[PDB]
Symmetry: D2
């Protein structure tokens, strides 16, 4: 391809995405991770955290819609919402889009990266932060969830795979963490989350996530969607003790979409319910999975993609 | 990211996929294309044509299941199948998987490539090529179905995005070609084919392949699925002049699976039928596409990776 | 090999140098070229023009020492210097290092680039540009020395390999151009210039630049040296109509160094004079080169990276 | 650049050479290193060992000439020669080119790679092996030199940088190793060697080599030359107790070149003596160097290029 500036995105240990930069808007170091924000011609601005794309501007709508709305849509009347992780302000954006929302609290360990999302990714946050109903909190979720005891109707979890042994994002993907999410939910409340890529042909982050969350939640329902941006099939899930969040009654998602006036660009009612219908190979793997990650023994993925587990 | 052998695989003009080569198994230069077959730790053997990967081992089951059986399961008792393209002949193996089938004519320019597939790609063909029902034909499929009056229930067009001005195979991408295909159908007959990546920010290959086909059949149904080893969302479609191929029942597709003892590894009735549920953006992209392609001005793929029309040189 | 930002730097058509970008400092697109200045751990700030690196910080001292002082030290008391090209103005700083010098006219298309150098490349220019002896001229150096009757003792041609058919700067690579240069010399006067990589298996840029110049001066001496940050063997030369610029004494070059209190960091009298000792292969390549380039058929660099002649469009 | 097969050659930690392969002649694993032999269009066949180019076919003549002949030329009458390392059979080739040679013994730890040089690099060895005067020995040099006690007029050392901590090529770049080379030399004998790249702008393999060899040899003279193949300025040296191997008398290298009938393609007499005249920056660094690598404390280069030293 053309010669010039490029970014070597890791993807899998055998497949690297080399992606053209037209211009480096911003790049640096926080006390928690590396960022690069550059100008893709294809997807506009792109944001790497560490060695992995985080979002792209022209496609983020697909990911943010797919992460939020299936959880909000699947709750009858979402009033208080917690967003764990998710610093660009887009999860916020789509959460704020539901009018039954009075409060939306967003937590996220890394200030300067938010400060970066704000200075340089207006396209994302879109004003979000400065909405009255919002409350930025810069802490570690596990810390936040242990100290406060406010409760929520939906929690959205938008965190970063727990990759490699040393990583401390690991103590966020244990069952203890999810009972801890659970501990903070009203009755009728639902959890929503990104759970890692599916490429089940290498590997296993998605199904262990599903299995582990299963140990804290009665009803765990796993859905999927292609983020073009990532060139990758991403796994998400919905969880609840209170009811099966994917028994979708005829006409109802659509009902709510109207009442609520959702400006949507990717999702429609039937597409949304489609995300939930999985190929057989995804079913089988989701079923074969037995690893449950625990505080005692937190799971991580090898840099070969394999699921390991040991103390921290 | 190591050192060692890598492939450099075009994905669009701004994203390139660098793949780690465990060992080249065979490359060379047929009079119709460049090819590299190699061994990766990720997807088993990988196959490249010019700058793109035709197919991967660990995951071609998916692409092929997706391509074929829609079209096949939507036909109530298919007997005569045209497979245009598909050197590998996994396209054949999936087809030869339906009982009903008496004769499947595989038609493909590049028998030297087909030979590689034979010699090196067992994993794909799985004897498909020596089925007493297969007719290997070694010609430009446009010459063939023009040079014959033979009839079919299902065509399956397993071709390849037709890149660049200079290419006799942009002629496989026009409403006169899809008409040729149409003319060569039985009364119940359905086409089903592959129709490009879906990557709405770089280009409109899929929509335009779809627009081209809306022009030569009543009913055009796009479906798509995610092919892991491509790292792409691929776009497919079905077209027929008879029924809407998309308004099936889900009870019936199930019927015909269990019925014809299809071994499936990816598809299920539910999943299959869902592939046909498109998100708002993509339905618009389709309902908004205009460019139809014709022998007169065929469309090719710009090396900026978008749809363009221009007259026939 | 990590992840992070990389440059992709053309070296030939089959070797590419991927350089790790610590931080882009400034890129953009002047009406004459693309440019990227960035920060690497290896060589400090790196500067790219189109697909090649003009210069590196930790090691430009070398390229510049090598370019300039030969030519300068071979002239017994240089006063008036033409510097064609050399945006960075390290070419200036080295020149402005000789006492004898009264006036150095730097002449260079692209003042926007020169501005980058000013704003971002202090390390290079080192005030060179504000020497009461420097005349920044912002024109096509071919227009300039054609549009003037001014005279010089040393010219120094710090241009750039002239790649591709379309380029008004292939006109800076002909015997009519080097004659223009000649015509604009004093009686003792010497040219010295940069003359391409030396990479005898891919191409004959150096020999051909040399052959072109043999045509417009009596005495042509190739010398070369290894520029680390390029990972290339670069080729240079001196030409004069007066003496052989190559038959110096080594006692004398030493004289003139100590004499003019040249701070040197790379060159020494011995080393400098040795750059002029070529191996068998390279002397043949030179004695075997034929292609001369002319306004009539100027030579450009093929994107297969070899010398080609073709008439003026 | 074009799309297709490529090889990612390491070079420096900040600069990688990505080099086009037209065809993979051969590649595999020995019990000691990795090989890849491929078809460059530029340089013809190329041979990687591990992650580093070893030779290229159209340019090897430059490297092999530059490694051998300055040592052989600088000996009055070279009869017995030892070549440590150097498995392609090219050092052999040029050593055999001097007619005063009756025996030439070549040692090299890795059989299968020789077996590979023979099956697939005819261009290199050129018959070499099958010359009567030659004697292939497949051992570790240090082992070979400790067991036998034959002696030699020139030793050529053509080994592979000692790179990274775990590497066992390290015990080959100590002073004890060179006293051990020395221990095996007739009087009037000279050592010749590749000593690593010069890029003194990163780093230091060349000057420590020079300094260490200096501790076993009275006269160590360091010369250099650009191998196009490697895109890199490579450092070599000549050593002797018996006399200054780079006091070059007027007309003498040339004298010997004639008498001996050297078919040379790169070197000439004056070029050969030129290699010995170094830039100031190379002089200064050669002089500032103080690290001497020892059995007790073997030196290696960091993967950042820095010279370290500790026990093994
Ligand atoms: C990168 S995906 C997600 C976002 O969640 C953030 N994040 C990572 N770890 C935590 C944590 N322990 N608590 C809250 N947010 C986190 C990261 O800064 C990023 O902005
Ligand atoms: C590998 S998927 C592809 C197949 O489509 C084949 N193909 C390419 N062009 C044509 C054509 N004009 N007619 C039939 N098959 C073709 C390729 O040769 C390959 O076999
Ligand atoms: C950076 S080394 C190079 C310099 O030569 C300059 N250059 C390129 N073309 C011309 C030309 N036709 N006349 C004068 N200088 C030029 C470039 O603009 C750069 O300043
Ligand atoms: C790669 S540069 C040099 C050659 O010397 C060889 N070599 C490496 N270590 C030793 C050793 N201890 N003794 C002899 N030869 C070696 C390598 O196999 C290679 O062929």
């Amino acid at each position: 391809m053309d010669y010039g500036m490029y970014f070597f995105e890791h993807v899998t240990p055998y497949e690297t995405l080399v992606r053209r930069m037209e211009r480096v808007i911003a790049s640096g170091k926080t006390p928690f991770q590396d960022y690069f924000l550059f100008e893709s011609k294809g997807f506009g601005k792109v944001l790497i955290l560490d060695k992995d794309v985080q979002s792209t501007e022209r496609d983020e709508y697909i990911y943010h819609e797919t992460l939020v709305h299936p959880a909000m849509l699947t709750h009858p009347e979402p009033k208080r919402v917690l967003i764990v992780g998710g610093g660009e302000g887009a999860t916020l954006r789509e959460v704020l889009k539901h009018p039954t929302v009075e409060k939306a609290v967003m937590v996220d360990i890394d200030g300067e990266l938010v400060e970066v999302a704000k200075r340089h990714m207006p396209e994302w946050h879109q004003g979000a932060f400065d909405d009255p109903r919002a409350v930025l909190v810069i802490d570690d979720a596990r810390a936040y969830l242990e100290r406060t005891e406010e409760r929520y109707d939906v929690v959205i979890i938008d965190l970063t795979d727990p990759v490699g042994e040393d990583n401390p994002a690991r103590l966020l993907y244990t069952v203890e963490f999810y009972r801890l999410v659970k501990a903070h939910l009203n009755p009728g409340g639902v959890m929503g989350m990104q759970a890692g890529m599916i490429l089940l042909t290498h590997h296993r982050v998605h199904p262990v996530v599903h299995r582990t969350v299963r140990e804290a939640f009665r009803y765990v329902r796993s859905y999927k969607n292609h983020i073009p941006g990532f060139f990758l099939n991403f796994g998400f899930l919905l969880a609840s003790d209170a009811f099966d969040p994917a028994a979708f009654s005829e006409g109802v998602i659509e009902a709510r979409i109207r009442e609520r006036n959702l400006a949507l660009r990717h999702l429609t009612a039937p597409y949304l319910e489609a995300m939930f219908v999985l190929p057989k190979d995804l079913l089988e793997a989701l079923e074969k999975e037995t690893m449950v990650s625990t505080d005692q023994n937190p799971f991580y993925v090898t840099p070969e993609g394999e699921a390991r587990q040991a103390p921290y």
